[model samples]
Target: MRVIFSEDHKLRNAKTELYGGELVPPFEAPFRAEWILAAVKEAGFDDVVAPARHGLETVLKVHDAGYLNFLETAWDRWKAAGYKGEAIATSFPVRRTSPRIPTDIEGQIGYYCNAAETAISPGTWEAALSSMASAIDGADLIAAGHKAAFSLCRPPGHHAGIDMFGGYCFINNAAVAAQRLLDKGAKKIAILDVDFHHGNGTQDIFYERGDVFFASLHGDPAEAFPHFLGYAEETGKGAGAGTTANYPMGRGTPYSVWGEALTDSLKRIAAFGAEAIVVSLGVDTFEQDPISFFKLTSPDYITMGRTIAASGVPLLVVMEGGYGVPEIGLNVANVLKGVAG
Candidate 1:
């Protein structure tokens, strides 16, 4: 399997993440990608290449132009506004607040962000672009008829929405990649997010469209970080009804339970007549992962990957989230190796 990578992911390094009522080092760091890249190479899947420059025209397919503009200029605007630290949202437009976007930079930041943990620091915009470029290139590889490919994306994107950014994500890379496949003559595509947290951004982007089938297995929203959505009840609306699926599991969940959900979702996708699949791959489900709460061990990933491959559908694996630990590499590579086998 070819792995698309970008050195520019180091450009968006942020120093702080709001966790447990304090500002601390972010779990989503550059080392996460480095570890995975090394492991994939060591596993003998070394066909690494830098991403091509895919422009805003393609990104606009999954994100709003105004949101993209904010991401591009947020840091400069925050610095110009005399902020001392990285730009973080301090206020929000909660239920019943005026929906009009504010003109002030500070208000704009709040208006566009879904979580306060992800800060807009120097080089963030550049890194996000390169991260998304990698995913796009991976999809291009799949569209050209390669059986499968890996995109080692950074500053993970499953948490980003059409008009908001958070959960360490700026652009919805998985959604953009799925759209790229459609534009390249694929009649239908299925996006299966195996991330620990709900792929809210990916779900939002395709929830109203019948052409793409979206499904996920993640920590239940009542106990997860993103705190809303991801319910089994949100089975799409309008023409998209019956196309979206969510399997929100609880704490201490095991692979036996999780894989059942995956099996059912794959069956649904096959019935949907999908030509390709975009996996929002995340390994934070590892039992040792600090931020997530699933009991999956290293070997479970191999099973997960092979099970997906059983469908006989081409796959575009786009990296999303998994904090750096020694086992992070092992689990991620296990998944890829399982699929390639």
Candidate 2:
């Protein structure tokens, strides 16, 4: 297994985030990736490597043209309006209902973004680009014959969709990587999102395409963030019928109980005969994570890795979400260690 990373992720650290109507220290900090990288190095993962610069073409494949344009110039627009500091959108635009882009930078922030949880700092675009580059670099490795690869992506991406950015994710890194694989001759691909939250962006991106199989295990939408999606009944639409699967669990789900859902999702992927697997690995399910709800312990991460490895396909693990826990290093390392073993 090889690890793909880049120092460029350090650029997007934000001063604050909008959580519960008050500004608070951002949860998606640069230290999140820095700590994971340190642990991977400490574990002596000899194959660790920096990411390559994949041009904007790979990103454009997954994001919308107008949205991409917004990202490129959002900071400048914010700055032009005499804002001395970073840009944070106050609220998101209603989907298709209101078509006007507000003149206020704050309103424009909401216009391009979906949730207030993620606020854009001055260097967000640079960091977002680096994030996508990391995933593309890992995907390129899989395309080049590596058995498995890990992309230690920062500012996690499962929340963003085609035209929206939020939840501290500007680009859907897993979706972009999966698309890159498809363009590189992969006949079929399966994206197994094991984050605590549903991969709404990924599901939306491939909802009508039969070529990609998307499966997720996350907090039930009725009882979690991004409440509109992630229901088990949303199999797929049009030609994508049966290609999508969702296993939503209530809060406080322990590994013993969640393991059943994981197994079922894995079975669905195996049945798809996917040539490759992209894991949207998020360890936020840990019992101590401040922002998430679940009961997975450090040792449980080993089981999670082993279970995914049983799928018997080349896996690309992309980092998603996991808050500031001391055991985060051990938990993440356990997964790779178990998978490699």
Candidate 3:
């Protein structure tokens, strides 16, 4: 198995996040990627690879130009506007607010953000580009006929939508990878999100399209973050109808139950006749992780991988959310090794 990684992820390091009524250090810290790399090395996967120079052009496939423009210039604009702290949206446009994009950097941040927890700090644009690059490279590896590759993406991208950025994500890395696979000639692909949190952004991006099947297993929105989306009833809209699947489990969901969801999702992916799969892998399902409420023990991840591997579809494991430091690495490596085995 090849691992796609780069030191560029260190650039998005932010000082604070709005969590639980206070600003605190972000759970999506720079060190998480470092630890995952170390474990991948210890796990005896030696073929460490760097990202290809797939730039903004590839990213534009899933994200919009105005939103990308905001991200690229947001930091400078915020600083120029004399903001004292990192850029975090204090208010959001809800059902009642004007839908028009705002002129001020602060208002623009709100317009482009789904949640206020993530702060756009200096170097974020470069780091996000690097993260997306890694994912795109992983897709390239699979397109070249490799069975699998792991993209260690930081500031995990599943939460980011076409024009929105939040949940510690900037660009929708997994979506970008799926599109890259299509561009590389696969007629159809499946995006299986095993993250503890529902991949709202990934789901929305392909919600109206049929070429990609999107499925996620995560805590139910009524009981978790990103509370507005991820309901069981949203089975895709219009042309995307019946192509999207959401398995929203309640709190304290153990693998005994969650594994069943995995099986079901894998079956759907296989039945879709997907030429390839892009996994939004997030180990925050670990019981000890602070941000999520799924109780998937470390060993269960191997079983999770084995089950997905049974589908016999090649996969690109694009990293998403997971907060536990060394534990995150352990679980991530377990899944990769299980798939490789």
Clashes of each: 0, 0, 0
Regions of candidate 1 where Cα sits further than 4 Å from its true position: none
Q: Rank the candidates by lDDT, best first.
A: 1, 3, 2
Candidate 2 Cα lDDT to native: 0.86
Candidate 2 lDDT for residue 242? 99
Which digits, one per residue and each the tens of the lDDT, describe model 3 over residues 1-341? 99999789999989999988999898999889988888888888779988876668778878989999999999999999998999988778988888889899989999999999899999999999989999989999999999899999887899899899989999999999999999999998999999989899998789999999999998999988788789889888888888899999998999999988888988888888899999999999999988888888989888888778778889899999889557998899999888988
Q: Clashing residue pairs, candidate 1?
A: none
lDDT of 2 by residue, 195-220 (tens): 89999988988898888899999999
lDDT of 3 at 278: 95
Ranking of candidates on TM-score, top first? 1, 3, 2
Candidate 3: segments with Cα more than 4 A from true spot: none
**Residue 305 shift from truth in candidate 2, angstroms:** 0.8
Candidate 1 residue-wise lDDT, 201-272, digit = tens? 888888889999999999999999788879999999998898899999999898999999999999999999
